[PDB]
Each structure stands twice: as structure tokens, then as C-alpha cells.
């Protein structure tokens, strides 16, 4: 259960509460940020890549 499971995450019918978030780059169901549509893992990868517009290291 992983391939047929990233299917349902985009399928989204039948009751509105059965629909859930899901990382697009991966298939992660946990720690999925609504802002990017990505898991915390993928988000970190791309942020170091530079492929995340404006996204920058936080030092203060």
C-alpha cells in the first residue's frame, strides 16, 4: 500500500472529511505543509537546492 495510496490522496471524493494532504514530490502523508504541498523532508531538499523562490536559511 503506497502506489494505490497516493491515488486516493488526489482522487478525493465520497465525504469531504475523508480527503487528506499528501506530499507531491514524495508520497508522505505526515508533516505535509499546506503552503508548499510538500513534506518536511522534500521541502528541506529543495530549499538547499535553491529551487524554492525566496526561501532562505533562518538566522537570528
Amino acid at each position: 500500500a503506497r502506489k494505490a495510496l497516493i491515488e486516493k490522496a488526489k482522487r478525493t471524493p465520497k465525504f469531504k472529511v475523508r480527503a487528506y494532504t499528501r506530499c507531491v514530490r514524495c508520497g508522505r502523508a505526515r508533516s505535509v505543509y499546506r503552503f508548499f504541498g510538500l513534506c518536511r523532508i522534500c521541502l528541506r531538499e529543495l530549499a538547499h537546492k535553491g529551487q524554492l523562490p525566496g526561501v532562505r536559511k533562518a538566522s537570528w
Binding site: 508533516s31 518536511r40 525566496g54 532562505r56
Partner: protein, 99 residues
């Protein structure tokens, strides 16, 4: 009467592109209120540094969204003429409304 707003992620491109419009409006017959620095809306998020499960010690990032305002007096088509479609941004979002 004409109010223009310029939002942006990069401050250096903003502080420069929203200064072009101060020069391109002043040298066309108008009084221009200079680069008004509206406060920034910092959008932070904190992610666990490892793909595994090391809760302590992570690493966070921020997405600073800058806002800059500029007002010009009379809406004459002399100043309008230049600021009409002579746009030079890198994706910088611009809002133009008069009230």
C-alpha cells in the same frame, strides 16, 4: 491620487525597482512620495533536520514578503505615459489603484 504597491521576496530588487518608478514619475511632472517601507510579513517554518527521527536539533527557514508603497499626485497622462507599460520587474508583483 494614484497609489502603487510593490510586493517582493528579494529586497534588493524591490528597493531598486520601486526606486525607478520614483525617478520615472518625478521627471515627468509630478510630486512623488518616496519609497514607503511597509513592514515585512515573515513566514517561518521549522523542519526536523533529519529524514529519520532526531527530534532535538533541527533547522528552520523563513519566507520574508516585503511591502513597499509609492504615491503620485496628479494622474496626468504625462506621468501615466511612462508608468503605463514601461515595466521592468523580475516577477515583482505590482498593484495600481486610485482612490
Amino acid at each position: 491620487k494614484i497609489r502603487i504597491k510593490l510586493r517582493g521576496f528579494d529586497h534588493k530588487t524591490l528597493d531598486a525597482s520601486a526606486q525607478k518608478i520614483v525617478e520615472a514619475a518625478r521627471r515627468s511632472g509630478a510630486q512623488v512620495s518616496g519609497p514607503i517601507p511597509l513592514p515585512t510579513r515573515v513566514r517561518r517554518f521549522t523542519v526536523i533536520r533529519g529524514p529519520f527521527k532526531h527530534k532535538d536539533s533541527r533547522e528552520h527557514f523563513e519566507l520574508r514578503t516585503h511591502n513597499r508603497l509609492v504615491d503620485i499626485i496628479n494622474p496626468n497622462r504625462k506621468t501615466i505615459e511612462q508608468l503605463m507599460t514601461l515595466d521592468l520587474p523580475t516577477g515583482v508583483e505590482i498593484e495600481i489603484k486610485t482612490v
